[PDB]
């Protein structure tokens, strides 16, 4: 689902929303973002913080 | 700067173009003296198809 949503967002949403007669376009998903999932135990081990 | 940096020569675009939100390159052309614009543009589409 993530892959399809990212493809639609990055390759279809912008051009469709700019089509003549199109108003609001709602994405049933989300574009990719670089997700950094932090581990609190590892952060505490190295005395680091978010 | 030499203590914490390195130098290189690369190649880069002096000006980047985008069309309808996507990277693009613009090509200007002319139909032959005895040829119409429509057929020249059809030939251009045929060439681009490859």
Highlighted features:
part of a larger assembly, 2 chains, 50 residues, rod-shaped, Multidrug efflux pump subunit AcrB (chain A)
Descriptive notes:
- This is part of a larger assembly, with two copies of chain A (50 residues).
- Chain A has two helices and no strands.
- The first copy, chain A, is mostly helical and 50 residues long.
- Chain A has helices spanning 2-17, 40-45.
- The chains hardly touch.
- It is classed as translocase.
- The entry lists the keywords AcrB Multidrug Efflux Pump, translocase.
**Could you tell me the number of beta strands of chain A?**
0
Q: Radius of gyration of chain A, Cα only, in angstroms? A: 18 Å
Q: What shape does the CA trace of chain A take?
A: rod-shaped
> Distance between the terminal alpha carbons of chain A, to the nearest Å?
29 Å
One letter per element, helices H and strands E, the order of chain A comes to: HH
Note the main sheet of chain A: none
Structural class of chain A: mainly alpha
What oligomeric state do these chains adopt? part of a larger assembly
Give the helix proportion of chain A (percent range): 40-55%
Structure annotation, total helices of chain A: 2
Beta percentage of chain A is under 5%
Subcellular location (chain A): Cell inner membrane
Family (chain A): Belongs to the resistance-nodulation-cell division (RND) (TC 2.A.6) family.
Function (chain A): AcrA-AcrB-AcrZ-TolC is a drug efflux protein complex with broad substrate specificity that uses the proton motive force to export substrates.
Protein name (chain A): Multidrug efflux pump subunit AcrB
